[PDB]
Every structure is written in structure tokens, then in C-alpha cells.
Amino acid sequence: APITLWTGPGPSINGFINDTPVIRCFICLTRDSNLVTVNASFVGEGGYRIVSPTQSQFSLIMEFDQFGQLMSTGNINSTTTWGEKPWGNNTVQPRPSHTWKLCMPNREVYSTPAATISRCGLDSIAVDGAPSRSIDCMLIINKPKGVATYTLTFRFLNFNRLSGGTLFKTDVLTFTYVGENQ
Amino acid sequence: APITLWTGPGPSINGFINDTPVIRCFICLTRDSNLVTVNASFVGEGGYRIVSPTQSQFSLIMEFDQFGQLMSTGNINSTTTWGEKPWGNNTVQPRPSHTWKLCMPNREVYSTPAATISRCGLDSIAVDGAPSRSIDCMLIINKPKGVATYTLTFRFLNFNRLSGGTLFKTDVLTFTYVGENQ
Amino acid sequence: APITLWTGPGPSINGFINDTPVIRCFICLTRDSNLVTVNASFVGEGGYRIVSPTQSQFSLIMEFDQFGQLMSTGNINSTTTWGEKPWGNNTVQPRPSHTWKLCMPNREVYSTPAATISRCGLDSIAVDGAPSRSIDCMLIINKPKGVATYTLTFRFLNFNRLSGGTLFKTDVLTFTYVGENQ
């Protein structure tokens, strides 16, 4: 069967940069028959409300154990809401099932780290998609971190593409990878 | 269950600008377990056959009611072919089902307008993907309009990226969003 | 039902240019209810290990018969591993099925060839996504070739975007098209 893991809608400030909560992350991992679709969006708060062209690139890493459970140690972690989305409602069901492994990046296919770098428009409606208002966001798959069995990294890059200070309100971002076997 | 709503193959000139039919829009919304995939392509006609660096940006809005039924008042609307694609054939079934809501952009997740701006190659096979032969297409999700409960807007932008006149024959465009609950 | 055709993990050097194996191609075609997702990645070998700004553009074409069986005559072809992925493991099953047609690009929808040109990051983790380390990969759908019923072409373009020599280790690339009817 399919399975979706997600933050739920209306996330708290659940993305930490060096132990400070600064980004609201909506993250959805939907496993259909074989592939997992990552659907995500991010909103900066406080000192990340607006990002400058000189902003250092940074990763938001999700660490998962061998059962596909989110660990407490990443930048997006089990201290904030995360769990299964039941078909038919918008709840987060936090009690893990064996099925959660199906949302993880297949260890054999991604036995070394893989990546997808894509455009990440910022404040796109308000700036009417101006070319110099996009950065990049690179998904890194299974780059090692601590004792995590699986990792998903959202790495925001190339802020120097920006013509000036820009609201850190990302587009909806999509990535795809091969799901793990049960 | 999954459900697809689409224009069918070989659409008529069904994209209206200033109440004039000027673009042939192929649009498919496929809901699988949780996410909806937008798969779309566009061909300009008449004064929109060729676009150039002097072309002004424009939007094609689809308006849907609370049941996921396409309304008559958008730029792409219920006055042209639109409905469900049966698994196993290429017909368009016009009679609404409860299931059509499942193709809609989830109103909790998209409680304010969301966007994805992406490259939109033009005439890409013919021009062999020359870098200066792309524009952008931004999908806007749930921009408020009229009495619509849901909206999808295809906004064509950044014609100034083009090196010159180019056939408005878009790549196959893909976007993804979280589906509404039954 | 859904169905996935793929090369399996850790593919051999299975991309041929002038009858010489030069690229390792991971290719996955996953059909869900209606759409097919192409998930692919490439690693150059030998003379293709490093690519330069002056690299000759080239295509890797897959040719399929009317039943969705991969033919022997494309650049990626039936002389190497290819077949169905069972749900639950990473094997490659050679036994054809009626379902394999469902991975093919819908002949009526793509009676004229379609394309999607997208960014193709190279060596992206190592170069931390530097903008000048991307090329383009265009998927061409049903560009006619010989006696094939369906074709998928991966055309690698715009090497002249590169700032210098770069390891031909692509990002995970994703494309989407409407699947064929049984």
C-alpha cells in the first residue's frame, strides 16, 4: 500500500540552524507503488525572515533510523510533529508502523549519496517570479550523519544569485527517489 | 482510489485571454494516494503562436467549486472539454463524482496562496534546448478569485529571457501539490 | 495495477555511443494510476568520466515495441539488464507481462513528440551545487526512430554552460508523462 509521512499542515518553527528554531518546514513524503515524492515548503522567521545575497548556504537534515523513524538529532527532528497522514484527513499519527520504512530512500539504490539540485523561488508571487529572486535547494539522499540509517537533506544554496534582501518564503518544492523495500 | 481529471488529448483552443481563445492547453490532474500531479503543455495560436522578448506576462486561471468542479469563469473553464479520464481509455467523462474533490489543492495545506516557478522550455526539440529559448511558468495554488473554492493558475513569465522570437510550444510541465480529503 | 520497469541498482556500463559502452545508466519507469514517472541517473566512464565545456552533445535513446518490450537497437537496450521490479525487492524480472505497455508514453497523447528540458547538476555534492556545474538533460518522448513504437530519449545538452571539466556524475533526474492504456 501507499503511505505518507509528514509534518502536518501549519508547522511550528521546526527547522533548527545550530540549535535555534528559525524556519517553518512543511515536509511531506508520499510513497506510492515504488517511488517516494518529497513535497516541501519553507518559511523563515526571525533572523531568517529575510535572507541577504551574502547568506551562507545551509542544510536542514532529517535523520531516520533503520525502521524509518525520525530521530531527535537532525535539524528537523522528532521534537516537533511528524508522523503518518491517514487517507481522508489532515492529522499526524505519530505512532510508528513497519510501513514507515517504505518512505525511506532505498539503501541499495542509494548506497552512496545522491542529490538533486533544483530551483528554489523565493517570495515568488510578490516578486512576480523575478529571475534574481531564486536560490537553489538541493536534496541530498543518504549523506551519512551520526548513526542515522537514512538521511534526507534540504540544502539551500547560491544565495548570491539574489539581487537583494528577499523574504525566505520558498516555493513548493518537489523531489523524487526510489523507496525502500519492506 | 486514484482519479484523473483532464482536457483529453488534442485539446481545442481552450485558453482564453481577453475573452479570446488563444492557447491550446493540455492539462491533466492525476490524484494518486495523497499528492496530485499536474501534467500540462501549451501551444499558442494566432497572435500567441510566436512569443518574443517583448511579450507581456499572462495568467490562465482555472476556478473550481467546493466539489472540485471546474467553473465557467476562468481562463481555462468549463465551456471546453473537461472531465474524468477512465483507466484504460482516452475519453473525457463529464458527469461529476464525489471523487473529483480529491484532485483539488488541500485548503489546510494551501490556506494561503502557494507557488512553484519552474523553467518552461519552448520549441525545445526544434531549437535543441538552446538555453535562451526558455521562459518560466509559475503555478499558483489557491490565489483568491470570485466565488472559487480552489484555483490553479499557470502564469507565463520572463519572456525577456528569450534571445528572440520562439514558437510558444511548451515542454511538458509537471507540478505537485497535496490533494484535498474526501 | 501499478508497474515498474528498471535497470536495477548498480547498473553495468549500459549506455552505448557508437557501439562502445561509456555511461552507466540507472533508469526507472514507474507507472501509477495514470502517469509514468521517469527516475534516472548517469555516471560516465572512460572517455566520458569527465566532461568539458566543449563536449559534443549526444542522445541516449531507448526503443520499445508495441507491447512495451525494450528493443536491442537503442543506446540503452535489451542486451543489458532490464525488466520489472517486484514490489518488495530489488530484482529485475525479465518475464514480460501485459502490464509492461502501461509504462509506455500514451500514443494518442504523444502522437507528436513531446519534450521536457531540465537542469542536470553534475557532481553536485562535491561542488556544493555551484551554478556553473550544471548541464541540461532533455527527455524526448516518442521522437520517431526506425521501427520502434515508443521511444524515450535522454539528450544531454549545453555542456558549454560548464565553467570547466566536471565529473559526469548526474543528479537524480525526474520526468513525467501520461501512460499508455492497456
Curated annotation (Swiss-Prot), chains A, B, C:
It is found in: Virion; Host nucleus. Induction: Expressed in the late phase of the viral replicative cycle. Homotrimer. Interacts (via N-terminal tail region) with pentons. All late proteins expressed from the major late promoter are produced by alternative splicing and alternative polyadenylation of the same gene giving rise to non-overlapping ORFs. A leader sequence is present in the N-terminus of all these mRNAs and is recognized by the viral shutoff protein to provide expression although conventional translation via ribosome scanning from the cap has been shut off in the host cell. The tail region anchors the fiber to penton base capsomers, whereas the shaft, built from several repeated motifs, allows the knob to protrude from the virion. Forms spikes that protrude from each vertex of the icosahedral capsid. Interacts with host receptor to provide virion initial attachment to target cell. Fiber proteins are shed during virus entry, when virus is still at the cell surface. Belongs to the adenoviridae fiber family. This is Fiber protein. It comes from Canine adenovirus serotype 2 (strain Toronto A 26-61) (CAdV-2). The lineage of its organism: Viruses, Varidnaviria, Bamfordvirae, Preplasmiviricota, Tectiliviricetes.
